[PDB]
Amino acid sequence: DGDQMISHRELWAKIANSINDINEYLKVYEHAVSSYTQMYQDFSAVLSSLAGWISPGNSVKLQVNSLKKALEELKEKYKDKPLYPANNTVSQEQANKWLTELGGTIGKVSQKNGGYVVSINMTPIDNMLKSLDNLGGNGEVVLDNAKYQAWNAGFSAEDETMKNNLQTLVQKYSNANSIFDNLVKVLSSTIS
Amino acid sequence: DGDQMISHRELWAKIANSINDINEYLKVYEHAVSSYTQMYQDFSAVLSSLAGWISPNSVKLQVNSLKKALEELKEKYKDKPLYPANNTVSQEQANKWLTELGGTIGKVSQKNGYVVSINMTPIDNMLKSLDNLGGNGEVVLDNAKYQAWNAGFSAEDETMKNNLQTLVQKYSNANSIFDNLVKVLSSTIS
């Protein structure tokens, strides 16, 4: 039973196969971080442009159509850029396994071509688009210093929501790298 | 070289030997985390007692009360080190583990025999920052002086907090390497 023999040559093949299996596991994390960094980058640009989209109206006059147009273009930009698998698609239970691995809030499962993918969770974008529409009025809307301060607080709260979501995603990727590094060091130091 | 054959029993043995070797890594990490955690818990207790040492518009500070508390914490952990938990090791044994854990978390001391004691440079900086304050116990400081001192005091606190956090992460990462290696050994059998 345990008398079956294998060569050193066959072991290195089994090691190299498992090495490639973990590398593609890391490249999923690598792409997931890269696409969420870009999404947060473009979002932070919308928040930096906010200063040029507000003006005095004691109160302030907010250009809603300019801000809503930028968020719509941002949501449309990452409609076809998912966190995983960046190409083709996988099954539904497979996408749910990666959603739970990456975090439920940072990702969102959706199907594209029969199968399913893990698209970027655009809930803070949707929440920012609905909060604007509830400031009833075509074009620009005037709000007192108190209401704008509360609306701007929720805007910065969603911005910090993405900032910490990205930081934990980077930490998981950094941890997986160190776990892979020492794992390869261990497997090589054994047959050395 | 590559034509050499090994049996399935030698496979299970070769994996188990590396698993017992990495378990010795976890034995060091587990204790070192436990020793630095108890120190930061005792230090966190001193922070909870800081509210009773400041009082009112300037502030008053029982400098000698906080000084003796910090100095007692260091003397408590002067003999309780990070590694080894018992006895001692060689010089290059403590230096290799100092580099593994980080040159900032620990300090290599000599016992007849070397040991990696807990690095107390944050406590030393706090004590000199307190000694730079006024004399004879209680000290009066305006709001500006308390803002600056508490800023550097919170910085040294956050330094130990980050030191403990990164050490736990290495221990969590080192445990998952043990877990994954166990998964391969269990799969090879059957």
Author numbering:
A (entry chain C): 124 to 180, 185 to 319
B (entry chain A): 124 to 179, 185 to 240, 242 to 319
Can you quote the paper on this entry?
Like many Gram-negative pathogens, Shigella rely on their type three secretion system (T3SS) to inject effector proteins into eukaryotic host cells, driving both cellular invasion and evasion of host immune responses. Studies in Shigella have demonstrated that bile salts found in the small intestine (e.g., deoxycholate (DOC)) interact directly with the injectisome tip complex protein invasion plasmid antigen D (IpaD) to support interaction with the hydrophobic translocator protein IpaB and its stable recruitment to the maturing tip complex. In Shigella, IpaD resides at the extracellular tip of the injectisome where it functions as a “gatekeeper” that prevents unwanted protein secretion (leakage) through the injectisome prior to requisite activation events.
The IpaDΔ1–121, ΔQ148 structure clearly shows that the π-helix has been eliminated through conversion of the surrounding region to an α-helix. When the proximal (bottom) regions of the structures are aligned, a modest translation of the distal portion of the structure is observed in the mutant relative to that of the WT. Fortunately, a 3.00 Å structure of IpaDΔQ148 verified the removal of the π-helix (conversion to α-helix) and minimal impact on the global structure of the mutant, consistent with the CD data for both constructs. Aligning the IpaDΔ1–121, WT and IpaDΔ1–121, ΔQ148 structures additionally shows that Y149 sterically prevents the F308 rotamer change in the WT π-helix structure. However, removing the π-helix moves the tyrosine side chain approximately 2.4 Å away from the helix interface and the phenylalanine is no longer prevented from adopting the necessary rotamer conformation that supports DOC binding in this region.
